[model samples]
Structure formats: C-alpha cells, structure tokens
Target: RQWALEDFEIGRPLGKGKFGNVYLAREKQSKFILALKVLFKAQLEKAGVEHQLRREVEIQSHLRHPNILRLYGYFHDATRVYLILEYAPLGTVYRELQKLSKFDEQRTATYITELANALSYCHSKRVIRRDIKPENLLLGSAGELKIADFGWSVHTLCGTLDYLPPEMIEGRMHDEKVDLWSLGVLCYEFLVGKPPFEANTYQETYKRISRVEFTFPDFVTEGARDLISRLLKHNPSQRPMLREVLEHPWITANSSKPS
Candidate 1:
C-alpha cells in the first residue's frame, strides 16, 4: 500500500526513540488513530543499524496478536522512514513498574500469562524475542500488556545482562529457553522490585547469574517461588516450556483473578 506524510495529520509527540520520535496521528481517510514512528535514515546509517531496523520491521509487521503491538505498514522519503504502529495509550510497563516499585501477585500473574501466550506465538513463528524487559512492554487501553519493541529480536545472542541466561553467558548455543529464563527474572523483578542477580557491578552480576544464585523474599508465595525455580534452571533443556508455565498452578490460580 502506498503511504506518505500527506496521508496523516500528525498530532502531539508521543515519545522519542534512539533515532527519532513517535507522534500521535490520524489517517486522513479512515480517521483511525495510530502512532507514527519517524526515523532518520542518516542516524540509522551512522549507527550501522539499518539491517536491525529492517529485520525488526519485517518481524513485527507479520506478527498478529492482541498482546503484540501491530506494525500497520511503513513508508520512507529521501531522508526519513515512517512506521505506522498501533497506539498504546497507556504507555510502557517500565513507567508503571517505576510508579508501583513492584506488582502484586494477581497483576504479575496476569502479565505473565499474556507474555507467555505472546511468546509462545512468537516461538511458533520462529521469532525469538531475545530482549524481554519491562522497557519493551507496553500497556493497551484496557491495561492489557503488549510486547512493543522487536529491535533486538532474532534467533541470536543479545539481551539485557540481568536477564541473560547461563548459556548465553557461557557462549553456548541457545534456543527458546532463553526467553523462559528472562521470564523468570522478570517474574522475580515483578515481585521483588529488582532482578535476582543484580549486583553492585556487571562482573558481580555475571558471576551471580553464572552461579544461579538468588533467594526469594519472605513475602513471596510458595507457588510463585516454585514457578520461578522451574523457569530459572541453569540448563536450557531443564527450563519448562511456555505451555507448562501457563499451566502452572500459580499462573492458573492468580491469572484469572481481578487485576
């Protein structure tokens, strides 16, 4: 489909990214609300990340799920590229977590379910979302969670150090289980306000992650601890699959509760 800047009436600025800014916009013909992500070609070229951008666009555009933000389409001019994306009115999960410090059992369980469902879908499509931190998650109008960024997503090695699995730390081949590990770390963060292996230094953090050293706070429930233990196993093969996580008693019991 042909698209151009003239086709949209750009409104207020929504957010800023590394290369450019996102704006609230409305399609001229359909009057549909959307987020217009404008990127500078020169900046992308300067950082040698054009390929990453292309891959992100390709991967995100094809993914169709309620929990994944939609990439409607894209168009580019001589200087800049524009990405048409679904507008998530509620914004990023990182901001929300910052406000609350941590989430309650019911809310964390609900988010985990949504993430599991979405990640399962991504795995089925052979898309490994290597990065799965709070900063990459967005909230829809109804407060449902949505995976928003795919820049670092690939069948590859690259993610936040805190969430990196042992295999990645040891320079071994990894698969979908890496995501399971991140989910574990994210689960811990949701309940404890920080990552389990977070140390004073990056070296110490890596040492802790390699040793798989962490303890749950006294306030954490038994079921939650059990699930986190199952997912955070050092051996990639030992990690439970997303389906098993969804079926865990903790998830089943709390996911259905009011958020």
Candidate 2:
C-alpha cells in the first residue's frame, strides 16, 4: 500500500504530492540531506504515465545549471521508483509568494533574469519545460531559485499548450519562445499577485489568455511594464529575446540576485 508516499522516513519530511511524498534523507557517506522523491511503478503504470516519469528522469538528468535543480540518481524496486534530488531547504516560490503576498519589483526581476538564463540554456539544448509555474520553482538554503519540475517537459521543437505562442496557435512550428511566454506570465503573477490570464476554470483561463483585453496594471513601473509587455506581446517576433531579459532595469538593481 505504501511505496512512494509512505514507505520510508529517515532524515526528515520535505513535501507531498499526488503519487508520492518527498523526504529529506541522508546519503549515508556524505551526510548531505538530500530530497528523495518516490513514485510507484504499478501506480505509474496504472495511471498510464510511465513514459512521463521516464521522460522526467531523462530530461532532468541532462540539465546542468545553477538555477536548475540537480538530480543525483534513481533507485527502483518491485513496486516503486525513487529519485535522489538536490535538497533545497528554503522551499518553493509558491510558498514564498504566500509569505510575502508580493515580491518587490527588483526581487522579481532578479529571479526572472535567472529564470531566463536557465530557460534559454535549456531551449538551446532542446529541452522544453511544459509546466512553468511558481509551484515548480524551489529555493535553495541561500535563497537561490531553482527550476524544479520536469514531469511535463519534452525535448522537442515545440513547447506546452498553455505557453504556446501565437505562431503555434496559428499553425506555425515554434521552438522555445513558448517558454518565454510562460516566463512572462510568471512575471505578471509576481507583480499582480494573481495569474494574469486566470479564470475560474482551465477552459476560461485559455479564453482569457487569447483575449487582447488581458492587460497589465497601469500602476506598475515603466521598465517593469515594458519588459512584461514585450514578453507577453501578441506576436512571438515582438517578444524580447530570452537573452535580453538579463538587461532589465529591475534586474540590474538587485545585488543579491541568483547565482
């Protein structure tokens, strides 16, 4: 009954998920408190998501970045699969948002820049993170943001449906610009304290996303507004390059930005 969710506990508790729970466990020799993610083989198979789990391991294992979470290795048994991951004590960006209610413009910009660097690098390597939301961003002990989840990610010439650029919607093949769109949405949420294209349901959220009426707040500063505007531009060509995101005024102001 308990394989991924409640099988073991040695170091401490980390967090919980649908198919499993993560624990802060030791690696025996190193004494490093690593976050161990567990998932059941039968459960995954039953859910018809073995490919998703395997893809997560394949995609995440290849990435190497300071702003991206590192995967150590995997262990498998009759019923379950275990992932040894880098432990981040500070928790997730979602929790951080809950604590602060809103991040200062400079802080959001710094993280955004770090994210852009990581995403651009991933795109260069043909890795696309499908679910690019705050909940998937974890913070290290020193408060560095790490891109965490790669479950929905795919290494391809296309990105996610939600982050799909206008060209993709219009039947044109696109690459990583879809990631840029999602990053822009994350920026909007950081500034406005809610998802910019939010609706009561996913379907309505899609509607709001395509609607030209979805707009930025007037009270936000010019530079911040300018960046978000460029990011969320209706045309992928109009959106700023991922590399350009590094030079934003707000990002330049933060001294303690991500490493």
Which one wins on TM-score?
A: 1
Determine the backbone clash count of candidate 2.
Answer: 0
- Which pairs of residues collide in candidate 1? none
lDDT of 2: 0.74
Query: Per-residue error at 139 for model 1, in Å?
Result: 1.0
Off by over 4 Å in 2: 1-9, 156-172, 253-259
Summing lDDT over every window of 10 consecutive residues in candidate 2, give the lowest-scoring window: 1-10
Across residues 194-215, which tens digit of lDDT does each residue of candidate 1 receive?
8899887777878898999999
Model 1 ranges off by over 4 Å: 155-160, 257-259
RMSD in angstroms, all models? 2.6, 4.6
| Candidate whose lDDT is highest | 1
For candidate 2, the C-alpha RMSD (Å) to the true structure equals 4.6
Each candidate's number of clashing pairs is: 0, 0
lDDT of each: 0.87, 0.74
Q: After aligning candidate 1 to the native by TM-score, how far in Å is the CA of 22 from where it should be?
A: 1.7
In candidate 1, position 201 carries an lDDT of: 75
TM-score of predicted structure 2: 0.86
